[PDB]
Design brief:
Belongs to the dihydrofolate reductase family. It catalyses: (6S)-5,6,7,8-tetrahydrofolate + NADP(+) = 7,8-dihydrofolate + NADPH + H(+). Residues 2-157 form the DHFR domain. The protein has a single domain, classed as Dihydrofolate Reductase, subunit A (3-Layer(aba) Sandwich), CATH 3.40.430. It is 16% helix and 33% strand. It contains three helices and ten strands; from the N terminus they run E-E-H-E-H-E-E-E-H-E-E-E-E. The protein has an eight-stranded mixed sheet with strand order 5-4-3-6-1-7-10-9. The protein has a two-stranded antiparallel sheet with strand order 2-8. Helix 2 (45-51) links the parallel strand 3 and strand 4. The chain binds NADP nicotinamide-adenine-dinucleotide phosphate (NAP) and the ligand CCc1nc(N)nc(N)c1OCCCOc1ccccc1CCC(=O)O.
């Protein structure tokens, strides 16, 4: 399983609002860092500009049509087909455009379900558990810093 989706979405599959995350969940950032460190993130241009700096200790690949894009510490690709040449474990990082382009191609999905309803303008595509086996489902821990219930799902495409 070398090609995966990595996403956090709420009960209505909202993933973003005005180029930011609608929630603050440190546990989920830790989850991303644990899964992706030492591997490769592929993300759309808008998601990269939301993040600003590339994330440390992993390969950052940005998909953009902009031939002027040349950011220190960032690798640039210009086509969806470029993804299939990246070595190692590749995580599709978002945003909405990337997720829709890749949900039918990935081997598996690491989904953080945020158990709330936020205002969004960007969405993860609908998906059915008739196509996806639950490899694991783990409730996130609530504390002073993580106040929204959340569940970590690992889904694997059924054969
Ligand atoms: N909750 C999560 O898991 C999560 C994850 C990621 C992002 N987000 C949120 O989602 C929103 C951003 O998503 P978005 O869909 O608006 O933007 P995006 O997918 O991050 O970026 C869209 C851009 O990516 C480039 N791109 C996409 N497909 C391409 C293709 N086939 N060929 C070439 N370039 C391509 C284009 O850049 P150019 O216009 O430069 O060509 C396009 O404008 C924000 O709110 C962000 O916070 C949330
Ligand atoms: C941490 C959110 C997140 N969580 C999971 N499980 N998968 C993602 N693909 C994901 O999105 C990562 C890409 C977009 O992330 C952002 C979008 C807007 C602002 C900030 C960030 C991440 C950096 C941060 O939150 O400090």
């Amino acid at each position: 399983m070398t090609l995966s989706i990595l996403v956090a979405h709420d009960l209505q599959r909202v993933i973003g609002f005005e180029n930011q995350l609608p929630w603050h969940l440190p546990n989920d950032l830790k989850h991303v860092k644990k899964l992706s460190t030492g591997h490769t993130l592929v993300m759309g241009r808008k998601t990269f500009e939301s993040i600003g700096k590339p994330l440390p200790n992993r390969r950052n690949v940005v998909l953009t049509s902009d031939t002027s894009f040349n950011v220190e510490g960032v690798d640039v690709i210009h086509s969806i087909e470029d993804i299939y040449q990246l070595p190692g474990h590749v995580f599709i990082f978002g945003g909405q455009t990337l997720f829709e382009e890749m949900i039918d191609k990935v081997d598996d999905m690491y989904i953080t379900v945020i158990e709330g309803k936020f205002r969004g303008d960007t969405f993860f595509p609908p998906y059915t558990f008739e196509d996806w086996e639950v490899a694991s489902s783990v409730e996130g821990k609530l504390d002073e810093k993580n106040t929204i219930p959340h569940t970590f799902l690992h889904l694997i495409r059924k054969k």
